[PDB]
C-alpha cells in the first residue's frame, strides 16, 4: 500500500460543543443544547462538508425536545481543516418539542443532499415511563399514528445552505403496524450502478431513477439490526454492518439489490452494542473499505479506525486507536461515529465524546469531535 509512505497526517478538535464548554454551540436564535449526539457527515459534489447532529436540548437523553442541527464548511475548498473553517451552528428542523433525530444523509449525483430522519412525539419514548424535565412521564412508543416512530425526508438543493420542511414518508417506507423505528444513523450511499441505498431498521431504503428526483422503495431484510450501516464493497456487492442487539460483535450480511444472505457476527469486529460507521474509500488497486467503531465488547471508549483490502471486506486490519491522537478538554471520546472522504485526500470523522460528569446519568454533557487523518496515519499505527 503506497499510502503508508505518505507523511502521516492527523488533526482533531471539538466541532459540536456542549453547554458546559467554553463557547458552547448555540443557534442564531439563542437556542442552546445540553448535548450533541448522533453524528452524520457527508462531502457534497462541490467539496463542501456537511456535519449533522441531534441537538439534545435539556439532557443527553434520546427522548424529549431534540432538534436536528448542522454545520457546513465555510467554503467548498477548505476541507474543514481548522475550527475557523466551519460555519456557526444552524438548524435543519426543530419544530415542536418532540424528537427530530437519526440523521442519515446521502449526496445524489446532481448534488441534491437527501437527509432521512426519524421523529417521535414530545410525550413518547422508546421505553415509556421516562421522566421529562417538567415532571411529565412519557408514554411508550406504540403503533398508533401519534405514538409511533415516523420516517421523514428533507433535502437541500443549494449545497446544504437551506433545507425543505421535512416530508413524512412513514406510510410509504415504514412497514404498517411498526412502533419503534430507526434510519441509520450515519449515511446512505450511491452505488456504482446508480441507485441510492439508505440503511434502516430491518430494511434498506432504495432510491432509483433521476438524481434528486428518486423513486423510493423498501428492501426488507431478515435478521438485520435497528442501527445499520451500508457500503458497496470492491466486488460491487452490498454489505450491511449492523449494531448487535446484545454486546459482542458487529453483525454482517452481504447481498445485492435482489436480496441478502444471513447476518452473522464478525469475530474480527468486537462491538459494545453501539452504532458504527463504514466508508468506501477507493476501487482502484489497492481497493479499500474503512470501518470505525469502538473495538471492545464492553466499552464505547475503544474507538478504532480500520482498513479492509478484501473484495468483500471479509477482514479488517487492526487499524489505529483514535486515542493515539487524543483530544483534550472535550470529555472521554467514544460512541457513535460517521466518516466521509475529504477533498484533500483525508478521511474526516465525527466521533461522540462524553464528559461523564453525571456518570451514566442524564446530565452528563455530550460533545462531538471532528477528526481528519490520512491512510498513512492509520497504517503507521503501532499496533498494526
Ligand atoms: Cl437508478
Ligand atoms: Na424542538
Amino acid at each position: 500500500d503506497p499510502a503508508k509512505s505518505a507523511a502521516p497526517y492527523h488533526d482533531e478538535f471539538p466541532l459540536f460543543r456542549s453547554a458546559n464548554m467554553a463557547s458552547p454551540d448555540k443557534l442564531s436564535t439563542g437556542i442552546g443544547f445540553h448535548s450533541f449526539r448522533i453524528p452524520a457527515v457527508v462531502r457534497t459534489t462541490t467539496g463542501r462538508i456537511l456535519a449533522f447532529a441531534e441537538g439534545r436540548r435539556h439532557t443527553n437523553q434520546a427522548f424529549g425536545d431534540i432538534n436536528l442541527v448542522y454545520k457546513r464548511t465555510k467554503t467548498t475548498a477548505n476541507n474543514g481543516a481548522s475550527p475557523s473553517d466551519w460555519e456557526p451552528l444552524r438548524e435543519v428542523v426543530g419544530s415542536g418539542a418532540g424528537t427530530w433525530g437519526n440523521p442519515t444523509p446521502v449526496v445524489d449525483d446532481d448534488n441534491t443532499i437527501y437527509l432521512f430522519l426519524s421523529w417521535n412525539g414530545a410525550t413518547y419514548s422508546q421505553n415509556g415511563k421516562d421522566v421529562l424535565p417538567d415532571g411529565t412521564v412519557t408514554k411508550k412508543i406504540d403503533s398508533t399514528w401519534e405514538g409511533r416512530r415516523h420516517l421523514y425526508l428533507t433535502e437541500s438543493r443549494d449545497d446544504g445552505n437551506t433545507w425543505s420542511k421535512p416530508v413524512d414518508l412513514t406510510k410509504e417506507l415504514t412497514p404498517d403496524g411498526w412502533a419503534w423505528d430507526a434510519v441509520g444513523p450515519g449515511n446512505g450511499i450511491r452505488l456504482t450502478t446508480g441507485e441510492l441505498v439508505i440503511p434502516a431498521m430491518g430494511r434498506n431504503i432504495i432510491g432509483r431513477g433521476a438524481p434528486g428526483n428518486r423513486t423510493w422503495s423498501v428492501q426488507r431484510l431478515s435478521g438485520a439490526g435497528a442501527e445499520g450501516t451500508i457500503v458497496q464493497t470492491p466486488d460491487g456487492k452490498l454489505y450491511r454492518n449492523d449494531r448487535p442487539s446484545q454486546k459482542g460483535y458487529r453483525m454482517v450480511a452481504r447481498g445485492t439489490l435482489e436480496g441478502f444472505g444471513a447476518f452473522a457476527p464478525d469475530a474480527g469486529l468486537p462491538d459494545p452494542a453501539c452504532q458504527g460507521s463504514v466508508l468506501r474509500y477507493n476501487s482502484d488497486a489497492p481497493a479499500r473499505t474503512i470501518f470505525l467503531n469502538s473495538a471492545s465488547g464492553t466499552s464505547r471508549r475503544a474507538m478504532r479506525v480500520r482498513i479492509s483490502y478484501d473484495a468483500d471486506a471479509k477482514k479488517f486490519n487492526y487499524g489505529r486507536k483514535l486515542e493515539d491522537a487524543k483530544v483534550s478538554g472535550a470529555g472521554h471520546e467514544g460512541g457513535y461515529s460517521s466518516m466521509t472522504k475529504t477533498g484533500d485526500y483525508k478521511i474526516g470523522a465525527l466521533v461522540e465524546s462524553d464528559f461523564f460528569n453525571d456518570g451514566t446519568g442524564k446530565n452528563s454533557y455530550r460533545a462531538i469531535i471532528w477528526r481528519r487523518f490520512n491512510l498513512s496515519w492509520i497504517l503507521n499505527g503501532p499496533n498494526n
Side-chain angles (χ1 to χ4, degrees):
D1 193 340
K4 192 170 173 185
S5 292
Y9 177 98
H10 75 90
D11 209 350
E12 51 282 325
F13 51 86
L15 187 57
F16 297 83
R17 304 173 64 86
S18 42
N20 63 320
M21 296 180 70
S23 299
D25 281 296
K26 299 184 181 179
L27 295 174
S28 58
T29 56
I31 293 294
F33 302 90
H34 181 279
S35 286
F36 300 93
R37 285 209 55 205
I38 325 303
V41 67
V42 291
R43 181 182 56 150
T44 77
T45 75
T46 66
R48 202 179 293 274
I49 304 168
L50 308 176
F52 305 87
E54 284 181 20
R56 300 189 167 189
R57 290 263 293 121
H58 305 301
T59 72
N60 67 32
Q61 299 159 310
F63 49 83
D65 189 15
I66 296 172
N67 299 338
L68 204 300
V69 300
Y70 75 108
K71 289 187 174 188
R72 320 189 298 161
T73 58
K74 289 172 174 180
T75 75
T76 65
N78 72 29
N79 301 305
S82 72
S84 66
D85 289 325
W86 290 90
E87 292 178 346
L89 191 77
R90 288 147 80 134
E91 183 174 69
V92 171
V93 60
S95 52
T99 298
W100 289 99
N102 283 72
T104 311
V106 58
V107 179
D108 215 343
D109 304 351
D110 64 329
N111 210 33
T112 291
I113 306 101
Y114 286 119
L115 179 70
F116 286 88
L117 298 179
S118 299
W119 178 91
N120 61 262
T123 63
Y124 290 90
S125 68
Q126 189 171 12
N127 295 326
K129 311 293 190 188
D130 294 300
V131 186
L132 292 165
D134 73 5
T136 299
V137 171
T138 61
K139 298 171 281 296
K140 184 176 191 193
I141 287 282
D142 64 26
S143 68
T144 70
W145 185 237
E146 299 75 20
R148 71 186 291 200
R149 286 268 281 185
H150 289 232
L151 179 74
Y152 273 90
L153 180 63
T154 175
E155 69 283 314
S156 180
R157 318 293 192 162
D158 55 10
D159 215 17
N161 198 42
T162 63
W163 294 90
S164 57
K165 179 179 182 280
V167 176
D168 193 332
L169 299 184
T170 308
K171 294 317 276 178
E172 184 189 2
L173 303 174
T174 310
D176 288 343
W178 280 31
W180 187 253
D181 188 32
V183 59
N187 71 276
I189 61 175
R190 188 265 202 199
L191 307 184
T192 56
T193 47
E195 306 89 348
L196 300 190
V197 188
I198 303 90
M201 168 171 153
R203 71 208 195 278
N204 291 320
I205 294 159
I206 315 300
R208 290 183 178 86
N213 185 26
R214 300 292 192 155
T215 298
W216 306 110
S217 60
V218 177
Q219 179 184 44
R220 306 291 294 270
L221 303 169
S222 190
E227 290 179 348
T229 74
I230 191 87
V231 88
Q232 191 180 20
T233 46
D235 63 6
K237 301 210 171 202
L238 308 179
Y239 169 97
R240 277 282 295 238
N241 180 316
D242 289 16
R243 170 176 172 163
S245 60
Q246 281 90 43
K247 289 176 178 200
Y249 301 94
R250 302 298 296 183
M251 297 291 289
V252 171
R254 294 171 179 86
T256 68
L257 292 178
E258 292 180 325
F260 277 69
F263 279 86
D266 188 332
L269 296 180
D271 184 272
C274 187
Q275 180 270 16
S277 60
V278 68
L279 175 70
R280 177 173 175 108
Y281 195 86
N282 68 296
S283 48
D284 201 15
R288 304 183 202 82
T289 307
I290 318 299
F291 183 74
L292 178 58
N293 85 323
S294 185
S296 168
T298 60
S299 180
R300 291 184 181 191
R301 305 192 190 172
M303 299 308 298
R304 187 99 67 75
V305 66
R306 308 172 187 256
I307 296 158
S308 180
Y309 296 100
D310 292 330
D312 61 352
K314 180 160 92 151
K315 188 175 199 307
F316 286 85
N317 68 357
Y318 184 102
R320 195 165 192 168
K321 298 177 180 177
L322 299 190
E323 45 203 297
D324 287 5
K326 195 192 167 75
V327 174
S328 305
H332 305 275
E333 182 181 29
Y336 286 41
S337 65
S338 189
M339 297 186 286
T340 181
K341 290 185 282 179
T342 67
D344 63 331
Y345 312 96
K346 315 287 186 288
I347 295 160
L350 294 173
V351 188
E352 289 186 324
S353 187
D354 183 355
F355 282 91
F356 211 65
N357 53 284
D358 189 32
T360 59
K362 72 192 170 186
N363 191 48
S364 276
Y365 294 98
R366 312 298 189 77
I368 295 168
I369 311 305
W370 166 245
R371 293 184 166 277
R372 287 160 36 84
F373 47 81
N374 60 2
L375 295 174
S376 171
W377 184 82
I378 303 170
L379 291 167
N380 282 290
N383 308 131
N384 271 331

